[PDB]
């Protein structure tokens, strides 16, 4: 199937309390494999996946060295953006950067993306053509102007179309045992009477991978999305994910409701009935 | 691999 590699950056300024805090994490699909915390003791790119351990010491030296340059680059960007918005010099602000590339089942390049944010709002994003930028406010025009004159779109494209997918394919081959397999959900249903007149019926999905999953209730075939409690897909902590879905039922009409589990690890969709 | 181009905002 399709695959992706993404890197998440968070730079939060700490005026007076020291140096801006920089956090970087790298994901292959839904599996984290690198880490960097500017406040960590090691001050190095740390491995977070078993299949990335085999990379040589030159790998960890360069990624640690390169990711530090991003924190240094973001350091001046916090100050530069404060002047754009005329913000207080003591206030704390955050810059978020997300970039990566996607590949298909054949391993060929599919799409690359690069997006930047400031204080939780979109600031500037590289368009899907990898040749133009999208500015979110007037302050972004300044960054867009400075990046257009610096051929930033070409430089980022040289990575997304180049070294990004090349190392994406290398990671997938190295982690075939863990990245290219699917874990089907461990589904079961539970019963909870609210009172002696109504009851709550919950459908469970345990220990599945990847995150994408669909759980739907049906009353005699009719979807009950309006009368349904849905919780966000959540991590179990062991690389697998969890999700449960509820519906309120009459005392004697449990059999009228069925829960449907849709997941790419299941060859056929499951139907759960009480 | 890290590939973020730090042109500068």
């Amino acid at each position, epitope marked *: 199937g399709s695959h992706s590699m993404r890197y998440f950056y968070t730079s939060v300024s700490r005026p007076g309390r020291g140096e801006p805090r920089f956090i970087a994490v790298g994901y292959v699909d839904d599996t984290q494999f690198v880490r960097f915390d500017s406040d960590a003791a090691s001050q190095r790119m740390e491995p977070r996946a078993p299949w990335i351990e085999q990379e040589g010491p030159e790998y960890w030296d360069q990624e640690t060295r*390169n990711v530090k*340059a991003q924190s240094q680059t973001d*350091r001046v960007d916090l100050g530069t953006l404060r002047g754009y918005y005329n913000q207080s010099e003591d206030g704390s602000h955050t810059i978020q950067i997300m970039y990566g590339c996607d590949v298909g089942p054949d391993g060929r390049f599919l799409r690359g993306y690069r997006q930047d944010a400031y204080d939780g709002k979109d600031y500037i994003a590289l368009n899907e053509d990898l040749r133009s930028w999208t500015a979110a406010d007037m302050a972004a025009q300044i960054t867009k102007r400075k990046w257009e004159a610096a*051929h930033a779109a070409e430089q980022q494209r040289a990575y997304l179309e180049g070294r990004c997918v090349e190392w994406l394919r290398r990671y997938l081959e190295n982690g075939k045992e863990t990245l290219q397999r699917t874990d089907p959900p461990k589904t079961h249903m539970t019963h909870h009477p609210i009172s002696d007149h109504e009851a709550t019926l919950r459908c469970w999905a345990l220990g599945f991978y990847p995150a994408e999953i669909t759980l739907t209730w049906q009353r005699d075939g009719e979807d009950q999305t309006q009368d349904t409690e849905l919780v966000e897909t959540r991590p179990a902590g062991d690389g697998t994910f969890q999700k449960w879905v509820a519906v309120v039922v009459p005392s004697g009409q449990e059999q009228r409701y069925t829960c449907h589990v849709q997941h790419e690890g299941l060859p056929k969709p499951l139907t759960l009935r009480w | 691999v890290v590939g973020a*181009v*730090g042109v500068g905002k």
Partner: antibody
Amino acid sequence: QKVQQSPESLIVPEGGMASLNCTSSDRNVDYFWWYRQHSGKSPKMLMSIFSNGEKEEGRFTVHLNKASLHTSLHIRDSQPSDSALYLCAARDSNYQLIWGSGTKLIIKP
Amino acid sequence: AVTQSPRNKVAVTGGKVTLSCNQTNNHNNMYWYRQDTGHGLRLIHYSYGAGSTEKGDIPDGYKASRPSQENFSLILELATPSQTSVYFCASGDTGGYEQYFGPGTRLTVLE
């Protein structure tokens, strides 16, 4: 060296075509550059390439074959102002530039 | 642009020589190369930002300092005849399109 550059020196008459070549012994290279350095001056970039194919900007043509890690610089209608040292730069996995020995272009007026 | 000082210097073996580089392009990265016939440009030191310096391909016998975002100095604690070369300063960005080169410093060290 990590980047091999040839020819070492070249003599071409006015109006002739000057063709240079550059090869990197490092397989983990994604970007290439050509800088022009006149004698006793700072080297300025001519142009860049990171994808297979040609790239024409005026009298200058740049080719790249990432499979063979080879770049070529071609100058049409050579002028005496083109007599300068030409440097080839390749980008490391550390995003650092690796520099070749340089090619001396001599144009006889 | 990028400026360097001094442009020409004659040094004694065992002496101290400092070269200062200034850039107004407000780039994040500053570099110190040396150009020698047969070697091209060889990186000596570079700085990803203010207050931090990194060793290059040939950092031996050379020291660097980055007090501010604009200034980046190369310090030669004990000049040697092998250090007689032409030194160039570059400013650029991590994945930058171009590296902007200073005018260059011609240093001659004599015993």
